[PDB]
Design a binder for this molecule. Sequence first.
Ligand code: PLP
Ligand code: PLP
Ligand code: PLP
Ligand code: PLP
Ligand code: PLP
Ligand code: PLP
Lengths: 295, 295, 295, 295, 295, 295
Amino acid sequence: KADYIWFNGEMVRWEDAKVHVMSHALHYGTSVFEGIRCYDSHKGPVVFRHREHMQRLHDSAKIYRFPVSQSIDELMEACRDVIRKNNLTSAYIRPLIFVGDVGMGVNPPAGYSTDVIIAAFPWQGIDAMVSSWNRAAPNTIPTAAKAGGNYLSSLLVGSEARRHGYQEGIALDVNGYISEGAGENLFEVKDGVLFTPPFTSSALPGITRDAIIKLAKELGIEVREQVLSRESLYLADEVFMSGTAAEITPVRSVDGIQVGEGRCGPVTKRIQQAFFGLFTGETEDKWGWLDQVNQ
Amino acid sequence: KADYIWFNGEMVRWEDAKVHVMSHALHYGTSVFEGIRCYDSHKGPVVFRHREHMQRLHDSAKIYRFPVSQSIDELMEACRDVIRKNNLTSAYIRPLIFVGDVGMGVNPPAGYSTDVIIAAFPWQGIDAMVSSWNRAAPNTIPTAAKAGGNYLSSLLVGSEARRHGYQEGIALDVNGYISEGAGENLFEVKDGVLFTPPFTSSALPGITRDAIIKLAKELGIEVREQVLSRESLYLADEVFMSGTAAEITPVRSVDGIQVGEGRCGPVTKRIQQAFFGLFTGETEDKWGWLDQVNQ
Amino acid sequence: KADYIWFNGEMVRWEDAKVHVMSHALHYGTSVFEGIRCYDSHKGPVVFRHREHMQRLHDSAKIYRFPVSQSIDELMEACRDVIRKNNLTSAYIRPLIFVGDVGMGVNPPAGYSTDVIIAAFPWQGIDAMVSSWNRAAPNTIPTAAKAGGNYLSSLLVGSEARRHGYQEGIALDVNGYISEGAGENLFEVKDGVLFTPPFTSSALPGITRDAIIKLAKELGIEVREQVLSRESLYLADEVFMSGTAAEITPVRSVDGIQVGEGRCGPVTKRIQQAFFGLFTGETEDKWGWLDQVNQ
Amino acid sequence: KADYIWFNGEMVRWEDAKVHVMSHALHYGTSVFEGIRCYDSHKGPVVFRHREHMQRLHDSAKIYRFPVSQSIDELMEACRDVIRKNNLTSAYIRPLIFVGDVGMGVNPPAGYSTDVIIAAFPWQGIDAMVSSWNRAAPNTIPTAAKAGGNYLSSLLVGSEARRHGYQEGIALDVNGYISEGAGENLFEVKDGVLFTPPFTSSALPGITRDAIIKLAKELGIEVREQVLSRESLYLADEVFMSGTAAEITPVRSVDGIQVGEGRCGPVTKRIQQAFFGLFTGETEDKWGWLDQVNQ
Amino acid sequence: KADYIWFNGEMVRWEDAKVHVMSHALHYGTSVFEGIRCYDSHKGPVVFRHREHMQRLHDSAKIYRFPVSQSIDELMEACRDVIRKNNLTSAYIRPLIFVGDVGMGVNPPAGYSTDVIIAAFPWQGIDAMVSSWNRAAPNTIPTAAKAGGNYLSSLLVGSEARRHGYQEGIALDVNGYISEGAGENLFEVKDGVLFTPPFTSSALPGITRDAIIKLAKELGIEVREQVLSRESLYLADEVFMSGTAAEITPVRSVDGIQVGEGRCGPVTKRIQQAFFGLFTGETEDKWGWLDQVNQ
Amino acid sequence: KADYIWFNGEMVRWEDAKVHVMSHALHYGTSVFEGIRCYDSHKGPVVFRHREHMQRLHDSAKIYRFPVSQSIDELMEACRDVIRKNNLTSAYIRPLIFVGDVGMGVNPPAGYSTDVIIAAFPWQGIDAMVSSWNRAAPNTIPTAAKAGGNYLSSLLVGSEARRHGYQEGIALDVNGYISEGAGENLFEVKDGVLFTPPFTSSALPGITRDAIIKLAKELGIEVREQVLSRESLYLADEVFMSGTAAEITPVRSVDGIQVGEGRCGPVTKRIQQAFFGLFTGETEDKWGWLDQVNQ
Ligand SMILES: *Cc1c(COP(=O)(O)O)cnc(C)c1O
Ligand SMILES: *Cc1c(COP(=O)(O)O)cnc(C)c1O
Ligand SMILES: *Cc1c(COP(=O)(O)O)cnc(C)c1O
Ligand SMILES: *Cc1c(COP(=O)(O)O)cnc(C)c1O
Ligand SMILES: *Cc1c(COP(=O)(O)O)cnc(C)c1O
Ligand SMILES: *Cc1c(COP(=O)(O)O)cnc(C)c1O
């Protein structure tokens, strides 16, 4: 927790960042959000993949049509201010754009607007389990949009797992194929080859997942994106999840069945290092993923 | 609007019913809610199917394991208190149980509690359109729960129709069979028979829908809950929707194709007469659907 | 073959009933048609279920929106004229409403019209087989509409069967459940109970199928409409198909597996008799299904 | 229009190319057909991908076992004869093989033959809409065949869009993934990459689509045939359709949501320049796509 | 154990009923079996719905075309002889029909034969879990047949449950609706109304399930065979399984959610009573369901 | 036949490898097996991709959790010993792993054990038919495992074919795309390009299929593992199956439609040659696929 939360343009003390109980988002799910990290690097404070997280913010809203007045540049400025103002060096940043107090109609009224908030606060395998709950089918609720009411599904998958002793629930899609974990993407390593499910497998265009396939590429790793069947979890040699909060989580077991040697992940280790190496200097920011706060 | 919103037990001045910005339900759509109508009748104010609505508030949370402190009777008294203290007669009541300012993780920290809030405020066919979006598939995000997050889907089906000049969009399930309108059930009359999709067609078990089947049975109309094909909409003699806020709306054209002779639903008529005769005294409340405020 | 074919209002000799090679129907499938019988009865010439066949004609067009100028009464008059003029007593009548010479655009041009034709000409089990071709999925091509391009599917199912020695191909739907034969409905008799698939099983609202469930009812037979699984063909006690051309066809084998005693059909026999009994006088036209030509 | 339609070998005065009204293709949609463009080029008249189109005429009939007397070269000569005898330069050619006046049963009487007829006549983005109808499912009515009956589906997807003010409706397959427009393929550009659904998404293997992939490869653009989710349409940088009659049409908005900056597709541009440069001589015909009439 | 297993028509000491290791069934899962109970009654030893279990043995083989020398009556007498011969009063009878030492080719040689055995040996709620595995889809492996290859599904659903602490795994079909538990049918109770999945939900046509439906009809309960959703499990008042070896087991928590008051089962109890009273003499065996070994 | 079947670590005269009739596997289909070939080579007796077949034996059991005492190497040596001991040069080796005389309960008691056997005995196109049965759906019965319960599917597809005159039945998945034939993988050839269904099409990860992909890559052919449609079968230039006992069989007509010229198979032939040349010495065994019995 901290002080100050950027909110509709201005910095507000943590405690006065309040909203009415009749805001649309609280009843209908109508908000859209992001997860961004800020690492202290060899040059950092640096936020990892800023522009790309804010452009996703804008895209989630585009799908739903929540009018948004800030620009990606305005929004990135803001996020840097929140960090700086709060005197944070390594934090989890959280932008949210939600339909505020507007009526109680599902279809908000014309020329209405969203209120936008940006808060920040300081920041072997694990045994996953396959869940009985499937992820969202296709043309039903946009899995590409990172919208707030999507997380009901992440709640179902996640709790079920925790409730039984695991640390993660991997969900299948309505087709019976692997989609992803409760709230983060799933990678398998077979014979030294990469492999993740495509988005049509109701997976979400993770930005970490993205950085990974790229590093995998610099690292000389073939990467195949394709539909994975349940069984593959039992036959893979490595399995690991990715996400802004998690980064790279080795999964050493799935349904109790050991995933090769009980976590060791030679490929995983290589990728991990490529990853952290970025904040250390060992890895070249070929692409331009670090955006210092203190510029 | 009104003044006074029952919030966790106390009545609060409406302008003061605020919630912090980091409340779980805003970000992750975790909240559950209901819609209840208060009608003025031949004796009313009379809350319609008050108990069924409150039980359903409880079923919906049971399904997501959200912890509710209040019993069903506490909730009912509080709804009646809310009506009175605002000096209301005919209103719309909105009870909302939601995960509050528990932390920022999807699985709320065990032993947390919800916040309940009850708010009340005063309160031919129509040309529907079949929508391009589909309702949630079966074992993904439970459609039998009136939950927050589900609403992204009523928004998608709902704006689309408005956007093209219709007054309601009817959604299909992932199998291509009729589900229900954006936020309300759908019925059709064929050779004087009733017909409405099963919950298995991704239809919410509606409290109004339930009332209509009962009345129908008393009016001696045969009723068939059965899966329906998109084309029946164009071949039916009558079609109409029902919901707590829309009672029974007849539909005169679907996709521009006139549902049998541009409205005058004889059966829709009789059912509209039975339903309203409840509040008039013409229809004998045999199930005990009306619950006065001042008792 | 005969002389005279009603065509757009007038009677034309069989040989001059011609149309341009660039009529829309020949290239795009855009026609809609019916099959009606005319039996010589104890009072007949009588056409069986006239109005209901012409109303279906009108409904197929309604789904597709092929403007039609004739009325059901105009069209029935016509059909009686064609019969009478041709001096037919027992015939197969064939109305067709197709998009004529209009352009080569799939979406015919505004205020265009259809040309309508009405021609007539004189009019154990069988071993069916289950086909590898599935029937049309749901919201793809209206199985309720009896449109001309639908018959590609009937061609696939039918030829496959004939090509292998059977007399009929029963098709499953995309779900793996029984839908119907190539061009006629499928009934199973289990323990003295009826059973046919509903339309949502991509079956077509056969008018014979309709008369059957009715007679079944007068006859004291319970009738259940529901989703049948493949296996049921092997476990049923009776199986039989229906259609305007076929009437009631006992199926004594399916995939070589005998369907109870190699056709005997006690229930089938009862229904059959109820059916023919109609033209004989033995059965009462409770419903009003005979429409004499010579009135 | 023109005068002279090649009909079963002879050239006939256009007004005389008539077919009896009881021809099979009118009632049962049994006919197969193609669309070929004749362009005037830096040497043209030049029939574009003439052989591929005629081979496809043959593939489509092979699939339904319609017997074709003419070889591929007979058909080509006849198409060139048709162009010449009508003194055409730039035209649209329509070859149609169809079941003629064989009897009235769905399975045409063995040893029957088709009738072929070849006719020729002279010849920002656009705002598409995602349709409420779905394209044919996999093993129902073969979508790899350009057949008559399939067209009921292009009509349904096509009028709907027109009916609501769009210039094209994009259809989804029964799985909720993008199939293709009403009668033409769909492509998207993302980070400068190409992407187009597989035939398995119920997409017809288009001859123009094929040309575009080839040119694209020569322009050095990466191409990915992969299943696509409805939402990619709103997130893509460019989107455009292709068909023999519509070449390459860019799409500027889908569902009212602007596809990246309301048209100017850089890549669509380059591909439009390569494709047209064929007829100009700027693009070297390496595959041999142009086939002169006068040779 | 016991001694004397019937075997191809002869009784054989238990230790001599051996079969070669290259018997079809051990490699390819080509056996078909039954589960039958002998009950000590108010007149028993009495075999429960003996013939119906033998008819189904026949049906299971008829579908896979396995040949059967023995009539139902011979199988029945042999069943009795095995009971008497072993001096049993209450046991679990197990008849198998399997493909023997025939070749290593999946299609047994023509005119082969199945070996037959008949072994018989002496014979609050539970807490089910919804399984992460699904049951056979429709036209894949006939589910109306108790083939032994099937039990790989039961093996996976049941061990998942056991491994996690539960005592029964309930499985969903491919559609996501409820099917049945690992080895038994599933009934739900709502407002004193019955409810169970039909076969098309990939439910074996249980013989107990049927007994129960028949009883309930006598008790005057209404029954609804209708498709069911996962969530209905957490909202019913009572849920219970049935099968030859579990008779009528009550479930009291599903996924750790109480089925309306940690068991109390009112309708469940009326049923069990009526069930067991058939053995006691209290329930009239109106149907003829009890066959005494000693006749 | 032969004499000496390995068995739980001992060699046993062929007639003494017997197993009790109440062994799990005969009732419940709980065995797991492999198909291996011993080839007389330019240096053989040589076992083809021996270890990979033994690893897969392990994998099949790992998925069903069947316990295994023997290492891969012990299974390998035992394989060799059975070859030598029987004085064989070319045979078909069959290793089984099955659940023995454990109880009649679907879940074997804890700490139980699987019995292991290893029998070995001496060891134009075809005309396939598309089957009316489909293959296991995705998360129902793991298809990446060669369990024996599975072969009920192979049993149904293959006998359908044989019964109708064909010699192989090709099966579709539940989606309607192509899966594989009764017992072997299916490859198609188009414009000198390879093509086969991925596993998610419910295709067993064949060991021949893999060999073939590897060869073709050496021959410089391009390969595409991609989902395939039924109709692609009638349009490819060459189609062929593969499996341990069929090596590489060419199909020349599918459903009675010639696969481009009643076999001539150019790419098919380059493959077979490269295949067989591994045994002759012509093809370099770059991978190490041949294990000599005598080491
Ligand atoms: C947020 C999210 C992820 C993680 O995405 P990153 O953008 O890589 O931080 C993965 N799956 C779901 C469901 C998510 O919403
Ligand atoms: C609330 C709701 C209905 C209608 O409910 P009633 O209880 O009849 O008020 C229908 N569909 C959806 C999605 C709903 O939320
Ligand atoms: C025409 C038709 C039938 C038969 O209908 P009747 O109207 O009973 O004559 C059945 N199935 C299909 C596919 C048909 O088009
Ligand atoms: C003909 C057609 C196309 C486009 O074909 P081209 O060969 O590129 O002309 C696309 N979709 C459908 C349904 C078509 O018929
Ligand atoms: C054996 C079986 C049952 C129970 O059937 P009963 O005749 O009633 O004992 C139920 N489900 C499955 C999968 C079974 O095979
Ligand atoms: C055994 C099997 C194959 C063939 O596998 P190979 O290792 O290549 O012999 C293919 N399909 C099925 C269903 C099989 O089980």
